[PDB]
Amino acid sequence: SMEQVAMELRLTELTRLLRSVLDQLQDKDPARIFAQPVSLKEVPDYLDHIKHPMDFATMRKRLEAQGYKNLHEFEEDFDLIIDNCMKYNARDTVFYRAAVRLRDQGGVVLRQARREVDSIG
């Protein structure tokens, strides 16, 4: 149907926007602390601590499969990245501090994106 095609055009557009958002957000992590999933080989106990790991590459896999139906879902994953980091890592560490910086720098990008998704529909 043409109704179905139109929904698919809107999902595709959402995806194009969300890639721009992801690239913008990934630029606020120059160190690439959040670029890949935590290694279970290099932190074996990780899953005892964090129930829902998240990372930019996993967000990207999902994105290219148009797996994000709206901005809320993408926002939930981005927040997982930050929130997992601030639980596992202590306040004085380079990791915790990179999370905080990403949260703050990211909150701008997501403030305007939320307007662009409403504004463009």
Q: Residue 67: which CATH number?
A: 1.20.920.10
| Nearest in space to 81 (alpha carbons), one of 29, 23, 11 | 29
Burial (CB < 10 A; 0-12, 13-18, 19+), residue 97, is middle
CA distance 74 to 81: 11
- Cβ within 8 Å of residue 55, ≥6 positions away: 34, 35, 36, 37, 38, 81
Helices 2-27 and 71-88 cross at an angle (nearest 10°) of 30
Where is the chain discontinuous (C–N over 2.5 Å), named by the preceding residue? Answer: none
Count structural domains, the chain.
Answer: 1
Resolution in A: 2.6
CA distance 43 to 99: 18
Token digits for 113? Answer: 């994106």
Residue 106 CA to chain centroid, in angstroms? 10
Q: Which domain holds residue 20?
A: 1-121
